[PDB]
């Protein structure tokens, strides 16, 4: 329980884009209250081999950060859409059609004109004006927030205890939220 | 002790719970409650009674 | 037996198998909010 704990699995909130709070993986537990030492020892080696994978998965995939579940992810640490620039082939020459029309020709329908060899091409930035920060998506909640294997739980001075497992806890208030 | 013992919010010391689905019989009586413990609260079930 | 130890028929007392923060919480608040009868201690002959 302290040596081989149950991992705290994180609850996502798709609206705020943050983790709600982590509770232990109670719903994937395996029942060896009817097993003996030939099989309790084999299941406890699977509880511990899983916890080695989750520490290995967090060392590969989770972003190194001080506060677990921060409230505003920076724009450099959030996956952002960076598309290719949009290449716009402009259909009509503007000042070559105000000279045909002033000369008396009625243009209708629609190089693309037979009376103009000129062709304008415009290249526009597709991405946003400012990079987005504040909340991670679903796919970055999968990469980060690997379930926390919390060895020897709640034994270190308080304040070092993980309060960001709790779904009521504001980090910048250091208090649990209420109904008002 | 002053701090971190008693809350500074409003909170009822005692709650009242109406049954959700009661069922009367000639030989017995069934009462189904919602024992709703609010957030930031603990309830010792020795303090609960009918 | 691993199931006597899981149900605390034999093994460590509540000062030892519980988390050390909960033991310090139940020791401080003992005079007004007792957590003592919530956890089972083994008595081994």
């Amino acid at each position: 329980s302290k040596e081989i704990p149950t991992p705290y699995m994180w609850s996502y909130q798709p609206q705020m884009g943050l983790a709600a709070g982590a509770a232990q993986d109670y719903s994937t537990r395996i029942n060896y209250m009817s097993a003996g030492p030939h099989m309790i020892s084999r299941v406890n080696g699977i509880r511990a081999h899983r916890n080695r994978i989750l520490l290995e998965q967090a060392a590969i995939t989770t972003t190194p950060r001080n506060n677990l579940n921060p409230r505003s992810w920076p724009a450099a640490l959030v996956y952002q859409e960076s598309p290719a620039p949009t290449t716009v082939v402009l259909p009509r020459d503007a000042q070559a059609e105000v000279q045909m029309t002033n000369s008396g020709a009625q243009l209708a329908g629609g190089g693309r004109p037979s009376f103009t060899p000129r062709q304008a091409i415009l290249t526009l930035q597709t991405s946003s004006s400012e990079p987005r920060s504040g909340g991670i998506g679903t796919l970055q909640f999968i990469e980060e927030f690997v379930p926390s294997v919390y060895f020897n739980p709640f034994s270190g001075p308080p304040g070092h205890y993980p309060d960001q497992f709790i779904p009521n806890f504001d980090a910048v208030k250091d208090s649990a939220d209420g109904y008002d | 002790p002053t701090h971190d013992v008693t809350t500074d919010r409003s909170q009822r010391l005692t709650l009242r719970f109406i049954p959700v689905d009661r069922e009367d019989t000639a030989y017995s009586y069934k009462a189904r409650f919602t024992l709703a413990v609010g957030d930031n609260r603990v309830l010792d079930m020795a303090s609960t009674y009918f | 037996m691993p199931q006597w130890s899981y149900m605390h028929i034999s093994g460590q007392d509540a000062s030892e198998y519980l988390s050390p923060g909960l033991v310090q919480f139940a020791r401080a608040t003992e005079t007004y909010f007792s957590l003592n009868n919530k956890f089972r201690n083994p008595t081994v002959a």
Partner: peptide, 29 residues
Amino acid sequence: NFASLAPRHGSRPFMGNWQDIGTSNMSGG
């Protein structure tokens, strides 16, 4: 160490005992 939750007898917290956290009450043993 949750000693600000204990009533101060004097200048020190009146913490309980470690060995009082459990129970062993059982009929006949």
